[PDB]
Design a protein around this ligand. Structure first.
Ligand SMILES: Cc1cc2nc3c(=O)[nH]c(=O)nc-3n(C[C@H](O)[C@H](O)[C@H](O)COP(=O)(O)OP(=O)(O)OC[C@H]3O[C@@H](n4cnc5c(N)ncnc54)[C@H](O)[C@@H]3O)c2cc1C
Ligand SMILES: Cc1cc2nc3c(=O)[nH]c(=O)nc-3n(C[C@H](O)[C@H](O)[C@H](O)COP(=O)(O)OP(=O)(O)OC[C@H]3O[C@@H](n4cnc5c(N)ncnc54)[C@H](O)[C@@H]3O)c2cc1C
Lengths: 316, 316
């Protein structure tokens, strides 16, 4: 095998890795970006995007990422289609092992994302991007004043249904258990909206099928209870699947501090905000943000990581 | 006078205030944005922008801000052309006094910027956007392998010349005093690049005039020393004026914690990152960031402020 050294290596071709490459290339750092298997990242799995600021109309997730890729290659970012399976961050240079060879580098920006899980139903698959979504912040406004269902049982599902209750005429929260696995303040607010409002609870139910037409989702079929096969059909215009994300950090376990799988960064207002627990390794995007999880915040921390990486490489 | 209450009020029409309005409007918060006197913010004072990710070619600061304004008004953000001159943040609702009336609100996003100061010379004015710049990160790459001058004497000037030394064939750092007012690590690195390289120092000199042609800057005329009227003419393709920024926070003095005039935010990786020292008041953009100071980081914290404001307003 091959070993290729780069002063700066970026892992990930989602908005954080591409923004980090355009800021690193205009800093004359000659970055190398490794795409991973999902070229373009999570935004290639959605259709219309209407919260990328400055793109009021006609943007989809694939066109934004095409534009980003064009932008990084205008500045001569070396793009490599590989995926990293093993890392050693405790010696210098850092060493990273991909399928197509070994990579070493003096500074590393990790922008590997935190992908949304789905139920795995073929009718859900059918409607992805036409009524089924895994991001309420992104897509909730398409359903303003319409009925919506959210499925899931942890923090993300209660957060998403809570967010959606301000936009949707009603929110149908679906879960298999007879309870939610969520933070206190989240459940208090949930019980408030259930009782004085907007959110309808459907505990002890599993989603059997998503129905719809040529245009999109029109319903969801549920089944069960504590002992029975009840079956409920809901009229709903959109389904938000909110069962959790998988931060792509298994390769970093035991090398970097993680907090529930997310990379912990130094953050703060005094600079070096994207530095991880190892000097010279920076993280950006959803891998280090389990709170906002948007393309624009990923591009902003991708910028910060490139400039933090430049200041580190220059001895500051 | 008039008093207008809004659940959410955004101060500032730069990238952070406009992104906060498009995220707040799609959260169904019906935001009101007050433009301030500089409609569109600092980016209306520059020409080509080539580090807004996803816009590889043809973008200028005014077109990006036009696009942002279109984006916020597509979602029905109420835009008010006024400028706030007095605030009371210690009673609820918050009260803010503009020239065209009073505004109260339950949550406030402050995105008032930190504007770059210039020397005030008419030949510098002449060349703004055609060789004179106040942002090396933004514009340094236009001068790759060319001679550049930076003028200033604090942290910003040494940071900018240090950044530019990796891009420019040489960097001419100009200052009136026979020393820099900068951080230790910054001056150590500066003396390193002066001695083993790239940066040429011109202490005890003032900038007399910027020369150029139809296309742009071609030189700078300097004068003086410790006792004399020496006069030096430099051949340079670009001048970076780096004398400092003015965070627009005088109205907030004594109401919010400030750090050298910048609004301090809670930051961190557990959410509520844009909250100031007062619950319900959030800050975004260059007013709370004296480290990166880019449009994309301002848009990212403008996003975070809108979602933090939404979670606060919903009792979380
Ligand atoms: C269905 C859906 C709709 C959404 N819609 C929107 C929207 O309208 N607007 C919005 O603002 N946000 C939206 N989001 C959120 C947005 O997708 C993410 O916030 C953003 O994509 C995260 O960017 P990122 O660069 O951190 O990571 P990602 O886009 O997740 O990209 C991660 C990159 O890391 C690579 N990678 C993974 N592991 C490795 C490895 N071991 N080696 C090398 N590379 C690796 C992958 O190939 C990938 O390219 C949506 C998300 C979902 C789930
Ligand atoms: C010459 C120059 C070139 C630059 N080029 C680039 C570039 O190519 N790319 C890039 O990424 N960044 C660039 N930047 C940096 C970029 O301009 C800033 O990072 C960004 O504009 C900051 O956004 P903001 O929203 O925080 O504030 P600003 O854009 O500064 O806007 C502040 C807003 O607050 C308003 N305001 C002020 N006080 C009040 C008040 N009392 N009441 C109400 N409103 C008020 C103002 O009217 C204004 O609209 C450049 C900066 C300069 C100086």
């Amino acid at each position: 095998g091959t070993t290729k050294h780069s002063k700066l290596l970026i892992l990930g071709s989602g908005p954080a890795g591409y923004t980090a490459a355009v800021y690193a290339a205009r800093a004359n750092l000659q970055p190398v970006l490794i795409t991973g298997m999902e070229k373009g990242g999570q935004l290639t799995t959605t259709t219309e995007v209407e919260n990328w600021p400055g793109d009021p109309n006609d943007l989809t997730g694939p066109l934004l990422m095409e534009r980003m890729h064009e932008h990084a290659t205008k500045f001569e970012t070396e793009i490599i289609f590989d995926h990293i399976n093993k890392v050693d961050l405790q010696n210098r240079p850092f060493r990273l092992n991909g399928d197509n060879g070994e990579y070493t580098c003096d500074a590393l920006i990790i922008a590997t994302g935190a992908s949304a899980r789905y139920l795995g139903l073929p009718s859900e698959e059918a409607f992805k991007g036409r009524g089924v979504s895994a991001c309420a912040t992104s897509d909730g406004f398409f359903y303003r004043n319409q009925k919506v269902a959210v499925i899931g049982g942890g923090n993300t599902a209660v957060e998403e249904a809570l967010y959606l209750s301000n936009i949707a005429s009603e929110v149908h929260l679906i879960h298999r258990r007879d309870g939610f696995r969520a933070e206190k303040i989240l459940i208090k607010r949930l019980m408030d909206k259930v009782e004085n409002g907007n959110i309808i609870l459907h505990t002890n139910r599993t989603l059997e099928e998503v129905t719809g037409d040529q245009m999109g989702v029109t319903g969801v079929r549920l089944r069960d209870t504590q002992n029975s096969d009840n079956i409920e059909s809901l009229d709903v215009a959109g389904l938000f699947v909110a069962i959790g994300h998988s931060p792509n950090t298994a390769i970093f376990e035991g090398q970097l501090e993680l907090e529930n799988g997310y990379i912990k960064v130094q953050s703060g207002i005094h600079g070096n905000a994207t530095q991880t627990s190892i000097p010279g390794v920076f993280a950006a995007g959803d891998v280090m943000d389990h709170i906002y999880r948007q393309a624009i915040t990923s591009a902003g921390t991708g910028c910060m990581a490139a400039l933090d990486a430049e200041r580190y490489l220059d001895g500051l």
